[PDB]
Design an enzyme around this catalytic site. Sequence first.
Site, PDB file in Angstrom:
ATOM      1  N   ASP A  46      24.874   8.181 -12.028  1.00 10.69           N
ATOM      2  CA  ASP A  46      25.047   8.903 -10.760  1.00 10.69           C
ATOM      3  C   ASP A  46      26.495   8.802 -10.277  1.00 10.69           C
ATOM      4  OD1 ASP A  46      22.383  10.106  -9.772  1.00 10.69           O
ATOM      5  OD2 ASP A  46      21.796   8.109 -10.395  1.00 10.69           O
TER       6      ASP A  46
ATOM      7  N   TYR B  34      15.574  20.193 -17.689  1.00  9.35           N
ATOM      8  CA  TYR B  34      16.650  19.989 -16.679  1.00  9.35           C
ATOM      9  C   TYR B  34      17.951  20.453 -17.327  1.00  9.35           C
ATOM     10  CZ  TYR B  34      19.150  17.572 -12.860  1.00  9.35           C
ATOM     11  OH  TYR B  34      19.901  17.248 -11.762  1.00  9.35           O
TER      12      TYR B  34
ATOM     13  N   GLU C 181      12.392  16.568  -5.881  1.00  6.74           N
ATOM     14  CA  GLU C 181      12.997  15.655  -6.871  1.00  6.74           C
ATOM     15  C   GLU C 181      13.455  14.487  -5.996  1.00  6.74           C
ATOM     16  OE1 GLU C 181      14.036  15.672 -10.335  1.00  6.74           O
ATOM     17  OE2 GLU C 181      16.242  16.054 -10.355  1.00  6.74           O
TER      18      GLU C 181
END
Lengths: 257, 257, 389, 389
Positions: free
Chosen positions: B60, B175, B49
């Site tokens: 993030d 995910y 990834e």
Amino acid sequence: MERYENLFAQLNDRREGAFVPFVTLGDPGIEQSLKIIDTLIDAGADALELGVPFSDPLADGPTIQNANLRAFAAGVTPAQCFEMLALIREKHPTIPIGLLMYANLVFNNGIDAFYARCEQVGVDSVLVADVPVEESAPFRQAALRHNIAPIFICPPNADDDLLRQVASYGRGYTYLLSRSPLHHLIEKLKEYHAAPALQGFGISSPEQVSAAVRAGAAGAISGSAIVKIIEKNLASPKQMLAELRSFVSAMKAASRA
Amino acid sequence: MERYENLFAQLNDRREGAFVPFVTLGDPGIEQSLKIIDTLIDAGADALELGVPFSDPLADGPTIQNANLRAFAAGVTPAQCFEMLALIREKHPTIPIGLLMYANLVFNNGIDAFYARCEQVGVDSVLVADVPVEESAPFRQAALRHNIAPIFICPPNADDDLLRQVASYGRGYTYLLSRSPLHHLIEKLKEYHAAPALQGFGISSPEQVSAAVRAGAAGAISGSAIVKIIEKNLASPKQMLAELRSFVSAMKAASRA
Amino acid sequence: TLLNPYFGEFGGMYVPQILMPALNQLEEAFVRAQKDPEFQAQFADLLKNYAGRPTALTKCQNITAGTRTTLYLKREDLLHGGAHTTNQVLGQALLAKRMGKSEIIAETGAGQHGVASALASALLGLKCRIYMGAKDVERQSPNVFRMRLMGAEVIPVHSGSATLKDACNEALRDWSGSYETAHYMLGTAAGPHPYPTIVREFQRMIGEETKAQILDKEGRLPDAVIACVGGGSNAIGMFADFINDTSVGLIGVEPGGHGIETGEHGAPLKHGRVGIYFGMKAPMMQTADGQIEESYSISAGLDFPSVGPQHAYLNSIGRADYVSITDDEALEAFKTLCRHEGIIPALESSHALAHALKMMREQPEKEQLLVVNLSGRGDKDIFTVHDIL
Amino acid sequence: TLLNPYFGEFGGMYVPQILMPALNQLEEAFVRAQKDPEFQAQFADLLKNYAGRPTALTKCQNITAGTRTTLYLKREDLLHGGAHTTNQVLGQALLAKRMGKSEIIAETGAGQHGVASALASALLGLKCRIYMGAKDVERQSPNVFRMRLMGAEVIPVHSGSATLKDACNEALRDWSGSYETAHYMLGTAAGPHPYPTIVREFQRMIGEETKAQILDKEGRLPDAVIACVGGGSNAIGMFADFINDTSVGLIGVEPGGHGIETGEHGAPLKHGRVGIYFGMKAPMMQTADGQIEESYSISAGLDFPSVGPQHAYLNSIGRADYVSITDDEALEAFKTLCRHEGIIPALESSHALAHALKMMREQPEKEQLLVVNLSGRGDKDIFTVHDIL
Ligand code: NA
Ligand code: NA
């Protein structure tokens, strides 16, 4: 009031005008001040006009503003002023002494009480810079009660009603101004029986003294011309008296004529 | 998409979970980066990834924010990223490679064109961090047209309608997140035929890998644990590989079980 | 969604999946509020008894002399807080309460929105945290202090460019994890749906009042209404009510900075490319490889590197026109208003004023009724203009 | 005179004879203006379309919690210019024009009046010169700049104490020689007749509006109206309309400074002696031998070392009460208003607020309807409070 009456009688008999210097009491110091006044008199002043340092001379200009500063910086106070006044009077029994004051210094301890101390110390007249004729009543009444001549300023912008009031309420002399037909003013004053007029406008040269006397004025008051010299010679005290001496003789000689 | 299918088939036959490290391309430099990826693989990563530095990673955290900084400071660009990707693929033909992107980098030069270059360089899946399922249409269609698996995040706050959509639109793997009953989530996903779930929440210890596999997850993604080491050892590059090596073996061993 | 998230092709909800539930909750609450007379009533009370509405519409006396132009200024500079930012911050703080939230997250560039968030929070009793790029904090001290005096927690952002861009990212990260207790009070008519719609509807009294005011004073609608465009809320509060009055021109002015040609400007709507960022699809300042860039301007408040989607949309269909004004032209309009009308305008609003001055000076014999939205007062700018002079 | 120059024994016209004609001309013009509907109409237009009247009456939400006190703030802080000073400066500038004058002389202490003179001049087209003690200029830079931007000539006074006292003297000297072309726009409801009457009548809309506003919101008149007193104009604009409403209390608050006992204050009405200065007979700060002294206060604008004669008069007959508030108490009222209601008050107005807080805190179970006149905004003070904090 008497001292004025007498002065004006003598000058007339010797067909000459009055020369009156203005000085700030205790400028640049107490002793230097007394020394300056003895010189003015000696040199020929016919009368005196003395100012008592006031914090906000809202009716004075910078030369005069700086004079109060120096006096203040000297520690001069109204009380110290009245002591100096008693000494001057004690050395010079005949010269008329007039005070230029601000309303507050007069009003502080009572109006009547202020004119009383004036009377006791031997002052002849008082001009209150910030009391117009319209508000003078309490001031003029207290003055008359203490044999003090209440002086009034006659401005350039003066009308008939005012001419009339000034002629009627004032004594000693009429303070004639010019703000940056006088012969008519002088005329109108005489007509209404106003106290002798002293031209105070801007006398700085013998030339102007002579013109005042010619115009019909009984003489002239030199408003800051004297404060000027002290200023210029702050530096050399002996040089200071010398220039003053000379200036006054100069101005006085020109009143004769 | 194939590479995933194949991987998950092999892991099953050896009843073991998948260990997937996340790293930022070109962090802390191009060459140091390639060196880091060969070590991860070597050490035991079942997949990769990789992130492409983006200016505003609004999805993030600081560790990852600092990683983009270092890459940028290295002069890494998206284009340089696609070159590096082609090299990795050339050395490792079988490992699945997934990209973590921001919508703008995908959209810049055209959506279709972006998935085309992915396809050409040999990438297997793409996760667009800021495209919710509700707006994924153009993204998922272009991906399918280029044989790219469109990955979707299943959040902690996920409902049934969403579970349903994610099961239906995603491929490669699901995910699975945890925001700071999963057995039910995992369950519900399986029920709806969703792609294998990879727990991405906060895997940092072998302990958690084992739990993920036990919970029902097909494996776990270690989101920043790896970015951490690079950070700690920025200082000693050789010490950097050594710690990474070890960490990965550690995590991988715990997937087996 | 109950409403449409797109204006033509601009808009949307480009956020991480985790924030969708927050956006949906907000949209529902808004639609419900909007229908609630008790909500309308409370919003109006605060606008009038607290903020100072309606604001005046001042006819200029001396600046249009020798011209056939009549200029009117909508005085948002007379609003409590000193700018239009106060209007929407009150309806948002009320909506936050309606949802049972007790915390407020706000991002601020120049500090005007920050200040307005702090005052609204202080008054309605919410805890308030403000993200401000550390560069912005650093030269926005006056507004910082002002924020802290009102009890707001100011958090400087050091990440990225430590500018507004970075503050908006930090606010979204935060709301991600705290949206159950916190409400994100976004600063302009941008970001993800429903924000462009909510900020416009809570800013529409500007234009509604201007219309009523001008019909009363001139007996006719203006020829054009002009407003600066940083992210777009004063401009859209002014334009909203006129959109259907097709005879009325709508002009938005973006900061030209040192001049388009120099590359140092902040006019993405006319000089940038459509991209996806801050949760929306719209024009933005970006590099050729898609990295977001900052907007440059002498005025601190026209720093949003993108623009609202309804603006990108009004341009595309030709309903509204967008122009740019440079630093030098805004500074001159600042000085002229001061000396001729005795009003210190915010440097932001000076961009709109510079443009109306250009309209009248270029065609002095053209008869036209213009309205400029004076978005703020310029007290905050006297030091700058000072040190420029 | 057409009107009475005295309020009981306070007041008068204590000026050099040369200025009487100017005062008489001014009084006549004022009486004539006052009767002229066309004048009334033009004054009202400017107040409403330019300055922003009527100002709001804000009910406090959080500061009186746990008390039986209801507090309302009259928001003069929302006036164009940021303070009540703007009201009267407009009627004076109009009266100056009515007399055919083309120049304006103004004195300023904190700079608020200076700023207001400059804006009014800029707008109605008069040349404006401002005297400001050089000490005041020196730490009033922000307002100086603001004055120059609007095109006013600022003249620092170095004479005396280079403070407000000295600026008022210089303005009178100047008007002496230029009163045919210049109008002296005095800053407060003090000095020679007719100024205390003119400034009050051009400041009375405060109270007229408050009355109408409170009857509308509470259906009754307030128990007390409170206002700071520097020279007296905000206080007299607030009180005027209530004077005949004997049930309503009138409270004025003078600056206590470091505390009366210390001698460093600015409360002549209650702690000074009647004297003659600045053309009037009223209480002032003076030495035992009659030299005028300065007023000390943390707040820059409560620096007039005397007070208006109608105030000295209202006290003597027991119609209004005067209290003092110290520096520390004003600073605390400044901080409380900020944090609880989101309003930065001027440090001047903080003196009045400190007093209403004292009324409610001392007798928490007493039911009372209070109105505080918030004379200005406190943006100009954040640096000070800052450096205090
Ligand atoms: Na923008
Ligand atoms: Na005072």
